[PDB]
């Protein structure tokens, strides 16, 4: 009863900001059921090549986080999508695209969500909207694979 989650993205996007508010390993209630989850951050370690590869081997579900301000951080999202497919050679894998507000259009955000078979969710830094939804959303998609 343990679901391994990985948060992927660039620095300054605030995966770490999103990580801390959901918790502050954790025991949670998903669908009336006691489940434990590991959120393993690539925080600070994003520029290390072989490191993230090791994370993606053991990780069972992914959060692809980019900021709604920078074009550059949004541009790097397909690289992270590619890396995950290289490690986990399977198209049908738990995935979630996450926009984080704290310039890039919303219509262009929905386009990449449509290109793949996975939902897109937007979140705020400290307003805490959809912060719980994002993990709970992914955990169910992980449980679906289980």
């Amino acid at each position: 009863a343990l679901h391994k989650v990985i948060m992927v993205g660039s620095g300054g996007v605030g995966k770490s900001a999103l990580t801390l508010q959901f918790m502050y390993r954790k025991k949670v209630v998903l669908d009336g059921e006691e489940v434990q989850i590991d959120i393993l951050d690539t925080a600070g370690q994003e520029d290390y090549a072989a490191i993230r590869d090791n994370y993606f081997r053991s990780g069972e579900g992914f959060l692809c986080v980019f900021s709604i301000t920078d074009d550059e951080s949004f541009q790097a999202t397909q690289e992270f999508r590619e890396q995950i497919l290289r490690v986990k050679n399977d198209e049908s894998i738990p995935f979630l695209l996450v926009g984080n507000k704290c310039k890039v259009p919303l219509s262009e955000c929905q386009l990449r969500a449509q290109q793949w078979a996975v939902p897109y969710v937007e979140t705020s830094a400290k307003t805490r909207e959809n912060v719980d939804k994002v993990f709970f959303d992914l955990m169910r998609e992980i449980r679906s694979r289980k």
């Binding site: 620095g11 300054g12 770490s16 925080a43 600070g44 290390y48 590869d53 081997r57 290289r86």
Partner: protein, 405 residues
Amino acid sequence: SVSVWDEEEDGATFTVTSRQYRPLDPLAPLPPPRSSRRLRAGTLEALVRHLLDARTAGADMMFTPALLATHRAFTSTPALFGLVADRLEALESYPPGELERTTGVAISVLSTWLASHPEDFGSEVKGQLDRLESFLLRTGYGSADLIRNLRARVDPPADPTDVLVFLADHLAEQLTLLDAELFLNLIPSQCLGGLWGHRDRPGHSHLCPSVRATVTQFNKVAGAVVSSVLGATSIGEGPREVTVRPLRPPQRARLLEKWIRVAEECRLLRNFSSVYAVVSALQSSPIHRLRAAWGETTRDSLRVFSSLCQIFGFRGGGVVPYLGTFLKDLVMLDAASKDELENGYINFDKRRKEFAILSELLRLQKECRGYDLRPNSDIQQWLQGLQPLTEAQSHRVSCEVEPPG
């Protein structure tokens, strides 16, 4: 016994912690209580008041080094220097006694700063230096020592399969040599999550150079392993542009064993940065697949490989840590605590947590200086001529080398 009470001042908040210790002679008078008035929050100007207070050295021993190491997170060097010059020029009209003692603290603070972070004093502070220099002569006040030192800082295609040709411990020494000097060049203030976290932002390409240099070497090593085991040399940017050496599985095994031993020799040198580069590279997806080659590997090599994966002569008493655990810790620490309190006061408690981590890599830096590693120019030029494969190139070659079944 142990008593704790808050305080409040012009633009700052303090916390006194006075603990009464039992005397050495049980019948003697109580010895003076050991107290520590520590700044907890406050304006930037208030921090400089506290910085230049003679009491701080003994009341808040680790305020000065913490402010100096972390100031780039919430200010700039010329502003901090500027405010110190503000205070001193303001005290010019004061009675000479208060002027001398603060000048003295200012002299002592800057000298510590100069010794601790010389790479702070660029041409950006030329005016502030003149400001301080004019002051010292105007008031007639190691002043001369500090001025001399401040002015001297402000005014100045290899074959990757050839890894088999070298002895493994010889390779580890060279890798450790390169990693160590990069770790000594590491400016710990650049590891702060408020700076490293924003390295990708649209104007920060030249920010955090010493940290990036460390990462680039970690990636060159992980590249070298991946490229070597695949027996491929990168001749273009494209996923196809690369020449492969045809190698049977038993021949690839020899490259696996070599690198496993290189890792092990890095572990004995306590160079964990390269241990983690080699190990994660061997666990890397284009090389994890290669079961035939992994199956041809000597079993004692696999045990050493497990032993290393479970972690994640005079050969120098040193260490090179895997920076990354530190970067992670600092990035998460930056996001867990706020820069400023609701009143607009700088949250100096965050910086205290930050500096504690920055302190640990300082002691590791001093430990690192115990290394006795001899340069090898043949291994060195081999490394410098090494052209590593891109992630896209390595995945393509792996498939052409050991196809899926």
